From a paper:
Similar to previous substrate-bound structures, the protomers at the seam interface are identified to be flexible and at a lower overall resolution following refinement of the total dataset (after 2D classification). Following 3D classification two distinct structures (Pre and Post states) are identified and refined to 3.4, and 3.7 Å, respectively. Focus classification was performed to further improve the map of the P6–P1 interface. Conversely, the NBD1 and NBD2 of the seam protomers are in different nucleotide states and undergo changes between Pre and Post states that indicate hydrolysis is occurring. Notably, the P1-NBD1 is bound to ATPγS and in an active state in the Pre-state conformation, but bound to ADP and inactive in the Post state. This coincides with loss of substrate contact by the P1-NBD1 pore loop between the Pre and Post states. Conversely, the P1-NBD2 appears to be bound to ADP and inactive in both the Pre and Post states. Additionally, the P6 NBDs, which do not contact substrate, are both identified to be inactive in the Pre and Post states. Two conformations of the seam protomers are identified in different nucleotide states, revealing the translocation-step mechanism.
Author numbering:
A (entry chain A): 161 to 408, 525 to 857
B (entry chain F): 161 to 283, 294 to 408, 525 to 857
Write the structure that this text describes.
């Protein structure tokens, strides 16, 4: 008994237990089960990192401090470990002499000992070496007779496929559900626990670093549960500052939310850290920073930058994505380019744009590729194309390209992402679109968008295109769109400004090779004859570097006069261009 | 007073320190993890180098020298005792009284001194130290591998509340450089051992080029100590010695299981006259169309100039299929890898299913079979060495055409689950099976610079102008004549010679006798596939008819005759 079971009650007299704050409805319900006549076995069902191990450490602190009823007064909470019972059990019945050694020491205790079996699912099938099970089949009489007082603490899905499968052991435990506390319920958890970390780290932790250790944990960390990550963050931040005082008021020890969001940015990647950066320079110039790489399209950025300012002010709907856009209009105008800009603004990486081409979803059978296959079908455990991608990046700009080429029954899949920000996978797991920006480019009115842009100034392309030919006949999808955005086609004013960032990002490395080129002003309209298109758009400009500028170097090698090291020009003549050394 | 007392004042008295060089942003991480109280147990995971030696020697350097005052220093911790645990203890249970006595009586001063434990994976990894770890006794520094971590330390649940994966990334060549910078404190003052600059790097460059299945620094510290053991024992083997340290000391140590000397292990600036005439041009005198990729398109790749996100070493090479592609993708791998492992062939010829979505560059969800998928899905996860082919893409209906544009540009690097794919060391040979099928007849007046501009100018841009608008360099493989295959039909017969001299028959064949085969030999449709069965049906199946009949006795060389309507070589 003293070889295996850790005694939590004498670990509470030394003050070695964490102070437990709250939990008084789940501790009282635990004592209500622990005082039952038969089957006095609570199982603290929760999720990993909810506090179900620090409920019995708030029961064992309670027995010593005496807030328990008489009947649980003066008990002992022993923490049996089923990993130390299957530890060296090689031979036949070395495990069964460990339980029947522990179970017979618990009967000498005449009911003065509470047994905390943490992770009961490790008891289901613990011996089980030759036949029927040996741990939750040896406890099974003394669990039903109300004899050993077994506080279990498993999680809900570990209860579901370990303990619920043994239906004769499932009834010997009573589910004391430990729901995770809310964001305000874990501040008081962490306000009293902060001094137990101040005495260990020799580090002062402010309640600003605690009110933001939980609002940033809950919002940004979605796989963990709340009083496990909020105390991870303060322990990581107090260890990050504990370097700054050891090795090399301005050499601080205080944790503030500057250090808490810095650890969380180092965990997840979301840079909302401090507004003492150029973010004050960035929050009102949010519409013109997109204009750095989205040339023109003032109706486009004033729809997307005003919607992502609407949520950074905490004013947008938290049961809806950050933005739901329909980018109908011409091709090669700034549709796909703004979403790269919007990803390079919000999550500052244009690799965080989940592009989905809806020409792959032409027919109705190809809708379970986005959402996932049902149980029992091909591609079930794989997932969906949209749902699993949003589980990869929950903070991403979803591009749904040419949605008018989708099936009509894929807008039905796209009614719940727009309205509620949810999409359930084929495996019954719901993915959360509340942090994504769902932008949907289309070409459904583009014939009438292009002809009327220099006629109807800035608002009449929105009205009166809807109803004769365009989307109103299927009306449930239009009103779920946040802003329907029409795109004015590009004149010569924009493609001269759009054809300047072709090699601007590669510009900052390749100087010493022998290349630095300033703007030449004579070959401007050579690219503005194939690239500046009223019909097909500005996308043939990207081929107008692959067809116009890059050809007579990489194949004209063998003739023996043109060798690299000299910067090329282009002039308006019938030249078949030369290059002088 | 023997077992559980280790004094760390001795480490400067004896010089028992092997200094760590290179790891500081991956060791101060294991001081961030260790300084916590939730999950304050760093387990060091990966390739070697740290192993509880970086935090203990990088601890006395900041206290005894004296830049910081004494009001801040005092973080004096200790290290592992592991040696006398199992040894010297006899009974069952009286071995256990030594392990319970080593943890409980270090608590004589109420936590005045703290202690780390090192290398905890064996089970002492959670059978006798598990209450000693759950009681909040003291915190330890683990060290596992990655796969032995997921054997023991993570499919548990009570142990990752204290441990966490600390991964170290694969180290430099400068790991053993500074191992021999400090260690001349022990080498030259008493033995006068020099090891020069090209002799430290020589036993360490063996990873990215030579062999890539094994870690670097385990193969670096051992192959220097064996090369440095040269003097005192080769003088006791019953102008005198090169005291100028060269590549020779490691080569005796390294090449005692390969057989390849120094001559191609340090391919350098002047060595590229020597790496032209080694193995490519002794099996076959020829195959010099593909030598351009190692001559003019090699200057901006192997001098620290390989930019992966635009094709610079991608020299385009065309031809037919089954005609010399698969041998050169092996013979260039034979010119590089000293062996045969390049097995790549991609064709889009005779399969009509909906499985052509996964052969592109991977499968997005909604499919079957991700484990194989396409061939290139698996050809980087196997090993990063493969030479990618592209054949017969020109036939299917035009909805499938333009997906070849996405990979060759700088848009997105296109991996599949988060680890990298190959962009730097691959030559792509593709296959053009347009109207170069009637041209295989004669070898008289074949075009090298009349072929691709006037024949291709009027036939390409009627149906599809988006295919040869990018790709322009067209030069043909060998035309299938007589004597150029008479070399190739000698290669497949000389492996029939070695198949036959094992039983005592040396067969000759004439220039007249193997062009007897050429009427039943090659195919313009399949390439040189029906060459091998033509050896079986014409000579080899009649040969085994005569070896078994006993009328071809071993020892006597036989000649042929021209005879009646079935052509066999009889007496
Ligand atoms: N109500 C609470 N009051 C004080 N500390 C708490 C409270 N809830 C949780 N904690 C602490 O936060 C952490 C939560 O971990 P646990 O209590 O083990 O929860 P858990 O459900 O057992 O997680 P696992 O995955 O089962 S180990 C521990 O360090 C607890 O001390
Ligand atoms: N409004 C715009 N702002 C900035 N760049 C633009 C704009 N419109 C077009 N471009 C340029 O045109 C190119 C269009 O390429 P592509 O993505 O193939 O077209 P599309 O976006 O229609 O698919 C982009 O690389 C981009 O640089
Ligand atoms: N970065 C480095 N700095 C110093 N020594 C190193 C470094 N990398 C490797 N070594 C040497 O390599 C050897 C690795 O052996 P070891 O630490 O026993 O392997 P493992 O860590 O797998 O147990 C050590 O003796 C060490 O001296
Ligand atoms: N240098 C060469 N010239 C002509 N034919 C060759 C050469 N090297 C190999 N071959 C032939 O290629 C054949 C294999 O080709 P094949 O099976 O059609 O293509 P793959 O091997 O790519 O499937 C071998 O039988 C061999 O005779």
């Amino acid at each position: 008994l003293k070889k295996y079971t850790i005694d939590l009650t004498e670990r509470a007299e030394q003050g070695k237990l964490d102070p437990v704050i709250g939990r008084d409805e789940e501790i009282r319900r635990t004592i209500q089960v622990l005082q039952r006549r038969t089957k006095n076995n609570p199982v603290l069902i929760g999720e990993p990192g909810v506090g179900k191990t620090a409920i019995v450490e708030g029961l064992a602190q309670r027995i010593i401090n005496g807030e328990v009823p008489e009947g649980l007064k003066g008990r002992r909470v022993l923490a049996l470990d089923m990993g130390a019972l299957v530890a060296g059990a090689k031979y036949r019945g070395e495990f069964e002499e460990r339980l029947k050694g522990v179970l017979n020491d618990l009967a000498k205790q005449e009911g003065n000992v509470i047994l905390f079996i943490d992770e009961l699912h490790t008891m289901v099938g613990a011996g089980k070496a030759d036949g029927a099970m040996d741990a939750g089949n040896m406890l099974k009489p003394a669990l039903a007779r109300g004899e050993l007082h077994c506080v279990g603490a498993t999680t809900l899905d570990e209860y579901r496929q370990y303990i619920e499968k043994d239906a004769a052991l499932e009834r010997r435990f009573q589910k004391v559900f430990v729901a995770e506390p809310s964001v305000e319920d874990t501040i008081a958890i962490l306000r009293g626990l902060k001094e137990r970390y101040e005495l260990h780290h020799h580090v002062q932790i402010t309640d600003p670093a605690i009110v933001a250790a939980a609002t940033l944990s809950h919002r940004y960390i979605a796989d963990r549960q709340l009083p496990d990550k909020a105390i991870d963050l303060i322990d990581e931040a107090a260890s990050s500052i504990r370097m700054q005082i050891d090795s090399k008021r301005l050499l601080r020890n205080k944790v503030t939310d500057a250090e808490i969001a810095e650890v969380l940015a180092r965990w997840t990647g979301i840079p909302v850290s401090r507004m003492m950066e150029s973010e004050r320079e960035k929050l009102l110039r949010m519409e013109q920073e997109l204009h750095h790489r989205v040339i023109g399209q003032n109706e486009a950025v004033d729809a997307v930058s005003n919607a992502i300012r609407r949520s950074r002010a905490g004013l947008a709907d938290p049961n809806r994505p950050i933005g739901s856009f329909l980018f109908l209009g011409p091709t090669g105008v700034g549709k796909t380019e703004l979403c790269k800009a919007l990803a390079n603004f919000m999550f500052d990486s244009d690799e965080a744009m989940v592009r989905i081409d809806m020409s792959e979803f032409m027919e109705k059978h190809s809708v379970s590729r986005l959402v996932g296959a049902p149980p029992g079908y091909v591609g079930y455990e794989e997932g969906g194309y949209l749902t699993e991608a949003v589980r990869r990046r929950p903070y991403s700009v979803i591009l749904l390209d040419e949605v008018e080429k989708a099936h009509p029954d894929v807008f039905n899949i796209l009614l719940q992402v727009l309205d509620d920000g949810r999409l359930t996978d084929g495996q019954g797991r719901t993915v959360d679109f509340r942090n994504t920006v769902v932008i949907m480019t289309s070409n459904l009115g583009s014939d009438l968008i292009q002809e009327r842009f220099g006629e109807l100034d800035y608002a009449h392309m929105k009205e009166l295109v809807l109803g004769v030919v365009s989307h109103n006949f299927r009306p449930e999808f239009i009103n779920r769109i946040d802003e329907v955005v029409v795109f004015h086609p590009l004149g010569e004013q924009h493609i001269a400004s759009i054809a300047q960032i072709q090699l601007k990002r590669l510009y900052k490395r390749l100087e010493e090779r022998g290349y630095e080129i300033h703007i030449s002003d004579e070959a401007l309209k050579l690219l503005s004859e194939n690239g500046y298109d009223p019909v097909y758009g500005a996308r043939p400009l990207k081929r107008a570097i692959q067809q116009q500028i890059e050809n007579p170097l990489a194949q004209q090698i063998l003739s023996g006069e043109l060798v690299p090291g000299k910067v090329i020009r282009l002039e308006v003549n019938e030249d078949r261009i030369v290059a002088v050394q």
